[PDB]
Amino acid sequence: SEGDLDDLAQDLKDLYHTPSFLNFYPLGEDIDIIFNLKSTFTEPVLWRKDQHHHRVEQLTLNGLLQALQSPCIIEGESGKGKSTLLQRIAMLWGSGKCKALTKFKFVFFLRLSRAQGGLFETLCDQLLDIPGTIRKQTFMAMLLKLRQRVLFLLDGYNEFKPQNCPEIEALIKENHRFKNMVIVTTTTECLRHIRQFGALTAEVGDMTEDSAQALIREVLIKELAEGLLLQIQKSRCLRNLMKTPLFVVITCAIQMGESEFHSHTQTTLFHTFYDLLIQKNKHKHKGVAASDFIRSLDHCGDLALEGVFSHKFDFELQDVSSVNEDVLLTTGLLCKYTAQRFKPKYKFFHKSFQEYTAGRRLSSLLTSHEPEEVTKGNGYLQKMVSISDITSTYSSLLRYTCGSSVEATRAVMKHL
Amino acid sequence: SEGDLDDLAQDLKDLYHTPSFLNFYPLGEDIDIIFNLKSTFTEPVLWRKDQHHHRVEQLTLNGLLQALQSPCIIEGESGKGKSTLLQRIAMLWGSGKCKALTKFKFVFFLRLSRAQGGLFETLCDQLLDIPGTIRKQTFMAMLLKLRQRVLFLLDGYNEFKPQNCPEIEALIKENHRFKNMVIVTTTTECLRHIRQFGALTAEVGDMTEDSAQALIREVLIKELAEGLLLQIQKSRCLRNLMKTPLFVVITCAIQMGESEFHSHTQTTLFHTFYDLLIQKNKHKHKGVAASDFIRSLDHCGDLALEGVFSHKFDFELQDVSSVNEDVLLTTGLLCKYTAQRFKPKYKFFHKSFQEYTAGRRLSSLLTSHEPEEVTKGNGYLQKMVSISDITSTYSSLLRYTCGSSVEATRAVMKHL
């Protein structure tokens, strides 16, 4: 019973070249845009983390793969786009081009969030239907005897509920009972459930200038691609924003379908980003009252606005003081960091995002029909009385506030 | 056993030459008109789609068949007449004339909308009754061992309810298990349920001048055929409309049964088409109240009319703002497009159809017994006060309005 093992290895190699594996939805299934893994994010950068949990050594794919350890934990950037890294590893093995992966007899790419019933059942139904020849639980014996010649690539750990498949939870933590190699991807918020068991950790970095331009050029009609690439080259700000995958994909998604180039000022870009963030997690916000959800978002809004005036970007628990923040963290407006820290820290996705949020909130206050809200809005606007702050500290805030409406602009321009 | 496989191949070849397969109803079974696949639409053209969902490289049948990939998705133009393409493939194989198809041992033409109970059961009852000599589920083992020497042609995907036959849904999406070739035909509206899994995609194009004339000549008594061909040659408008199959077959259907040639002004042609759309799908409009169906049609009518005045043919969701629009999408008045775009768009079947729709609505308003509706009708008519618009922009609108009613004509002519 050896011939069928070679067949399994070959079928997996061919499986990882199929469109059903290579095609994915970068903004989620709700938006029907499909990228082909083959010509998209093909040049990732990974930072290694040391005992102090900071970044050391810039590593790249096909570099890290030459120095894999017992279970490796790769942390998503901050919960940005899809961590299309494990898929790239499986693809390279299937192509047989990366020397580092030639030692592996099998590579099993699994979506852990859908695992249930046991490891063998997960493999049988989720990947390749295993021939009855050896479908007698002797497969597991083969893997144990085989040792570290197989990779289990487990995506979506943060979405995994271990009660559904204790066998895999054991594989991730109790690796000494399997004697094989595992790579798991997670998010910052759920890192605490693991990490302890990692032999090597890595963080996904941002995009390079060449990667971002290549992604735009190859996934957008030439005329719009040239328009966008030119605008990025002209702007001294976009080139710094176009490092974050989501802000590279969104700027294309909003242009596809058009027959002409549109500038799409960053204010609209941040607005689009915001709506995607608020709505994509809406499917999990059914657990709270709609009024509680809005109150939480408004609270976050005021937090950002006060933060801008106080030059504060790093928040502690007592600065939020809301048990209902769980929906806010689910939403993803704030990221909760719990590394080598006595007290948890809360941060906004990006400093420019915090400024946007503050702007949106101020704009809303200044246009409210309720005089109490308008007064509060004016209370903040009335601080814009010094040129050294107007053209500096609050430059972003004023731009985002004005770009969010018409009436808000009147209020701001009259003051200025 | 090998002799039984040969008998099946031969029986299928002969099956596809049988009138029960070749004869079809181009306007649906409700209208008792039968076309013979052998002499009708014999020269289709297909457009290959690129990664941007744009049309490139016009292909022909017996061309595309030389470059087939794992499961191929062919999209109907917009939901027109029967997509008699897969049947042509079955014939070409059965006749043994197309070299590209000579490699196939079996070709299975299935009407997916009528599948249930499993793939083997569907094949046994829908096509050729498989002899009891090999009807032991060993047929599937044969197909798996045989590999890509068979074609599954699955028509009517948009009408398929996968819960009835998970085996075929698997065949369409999970083809890594089957290792055979599948061609699926679908519609724009249901494309989003697939595509990701497609290796190659194509769009069905329009008719050539020679094809349309051949279709008229061979399916209409000589005297009427000559009359129609001459009228098309004289006019400067029909020749552009006679590219859409629906407007080639309808113009014949309304003449067959007559003993003389009638001009049948294109206003009546568009009327006939409109009436068919709201009736052929009537069988699926039983899920709404009668008053809601009419309100949706009136809403669509006003949408078209405003669009004519605003030069707007491309609508978004917020321009309709009605959850009940599903009945219009079911009807086929509006087509929903979900390509590589951030937001969905809605379009009318054809710009000339939108103009007709607007005309029909304006005509109705101008003849209503309710003075409020008449006022609205006049509100639009009162804009026809500039010669540069009267003989241009609104030329079609005025013609369709007048040709829809005598009373509407009086209102229009008095104004002009």
From Swiss-Prot, chains A, B:
Phosphorylation is essential for NLRC4 inflammasome function to promote caspase-1 activation and pyroptosis. It comes from the Eukaryota. It is found in: Cytoplasm; Cytoplasm, Cytosol; Inflammasome. Residues 70-383 form the NACHT domain. Isoform 2 is expressed ubiquitously, although highly expressed in lung and spleen. Isoform 1 is highly expressed in lung, followed by leukocytes especially monocytes, lymph node, colon, brain, prostate, placenta, spleen, bone marrow and fetal liver. Isoform 4 is only detected in brain. Changing T244S: In AIFEC; results in a gain of function mutation with constitutive activation of caspase-1. ATP binds at G76, E77, S78, G79, K80, G81, K82, S83. Residues 263-370 are annotated as: Winged-helix domain (WHD). Residues 2-205 are annotated as: Nucleotide-binding domain (NBD). Key component of inflammasomes that indirectly senses specific proteins from pathogenic bacteria and fungi and responds by assembling an inflammasome complex that promotes caspase-1 activation, cytokine production and macrophage pyroptosis. The NLRC4 inflammasome is activated as part of the innate immune response to a range of intracellular bacteria. In an autoinhibited form the C-terminal leucine-rich repeat (LRR) domain is positioned to sterically occlude one side of the NBD domain and consequently sequester NLRC4 in a monomeric state. An ADP-mediated interaction between the NBD and the WHD also contributes to the autoinhibition. Homooligomer; homooligomerizes to induce formation of the NLRC4 inflammasome. Homooligomerizes following activation by pathogenic proteins. Component of the NLRC4 inflammasome, at least composed of NLRC4 and caspase-1 (CASP1). Some NLRC4 inflammasomes contain PYCARD/ASC, while some others directly contact and activate CASP1. Interacts (via CARD domain) with PYCARD/ASC, pro-caspase-1 (CASP1), NOD2, BCL10 and NALP1 (NAC) by CARD-CARD interaction. Interacts with EIF2AK2/PKR. This is NLR family CARD domain-containing protein 4. It comes from Homo sapiens.
